[PDB]
């Protein structure tokens, strides 16, 4: 028998802020997904999950005519989540 939190170790990353639209590439790919993959492939080797998410958000920082801002939500991680790709 042991005690446990009901809800813990969650993190959510939404493609947009509440009440707002999400956009796709001329080719049809989601900007959110495309940049998420790009930042993971480049930075998973040396950065934990939150820093990767932050880099994704930074890539949307400059406003354009179809802006969106990915949003970290309901985050209850208590440690850094390193993926250690290749191990």
């Amino acid at each position: 028998v042991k005690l446990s939190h009901v809800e813990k170790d969650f993190i959510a990353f939404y493609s947009t802020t509440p009440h707002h639209l999400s956009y796709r590439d001329k080719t049809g790919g989601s900007y959110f997904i495309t940049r998420l993959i790009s930042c993971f492939r480049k930075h998973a080797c040396s950065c934990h999950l939150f820093d990767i998410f932050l880099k994704v958000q930074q890539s949307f920082e400059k406003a354009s005519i179809h802006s969106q801002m990915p949003t970290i939500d309901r985050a209850t991680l208590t440690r850094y989540f390193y993926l250690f790709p290749g191990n």
Binding site: I11, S22, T27, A44, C45, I65, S67, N87
Partner: protein
């Protein structure tokens, strides 16, 4: 995908053990991830390019070490059923984490099933996802990172404006 060296993997897991999530060695590791994607809808527009997103997320998660489960064209109850099935996989116990990727039409409070419309609501509350996977209902992922990626709009308003 750029890889981390075994030396740095071992260095970090030793130097900052109490502040990183522990990683299981790949030999007996059984990482599972879930992708739920709705492309075609009874009342809503077709989501062109969704398969490009599936293929891109599937390949990235595999490169990260996850065996990827893909479920498509589900109602809200179908998404709930599939998530409960996925949350109960015994392979989570021999895993260290999971990713849950959800791609569909979205509202402020949830993700749309294939049958959604204003007159025929078909939505899975984002709050329900946490209930399905929390420490009460998902024992295999207790103490392990549960990463939710949400590919969906959260409303109908433009996200930019003009200023001076």
């Amino acid at each position: 995908l750029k890889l981390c060296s075994p030396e740095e993997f071992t260095r970090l897991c030793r130097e900052k053990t109490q502040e990183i999530y522990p990683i299981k060695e790949a030999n007996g590791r059984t990482r599972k991830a879930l992708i739920i994607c709705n492309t075609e809808f009874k009342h809503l527009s077709l989501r062109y390019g969704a398969n490009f997103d599936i293929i891109g997320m599937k390949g990235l998660l595999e490169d990260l070490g996850y065996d990827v489960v893909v479920k498509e064209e589900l109602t809200a109850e179908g998404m709930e059923s599939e998530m409960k099935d996925f949350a109960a996989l015994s392979e989570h116990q021999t895993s260290d984490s999971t990713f849950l990727v959800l791609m569909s039409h979205g509202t402020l409070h949830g993700i749309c099933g294939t049958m959604h419309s204003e007159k025929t609501p078909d939505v899975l509350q984002y709050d329900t996802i946490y209930q399905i996977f929390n420490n009460c209902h998902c024992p295999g992922l207790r103490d392990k990172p549960k990463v939710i990626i949400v590919q969906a709009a959260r409303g109908g308003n433009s996200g930019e404006m003009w200023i001076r």
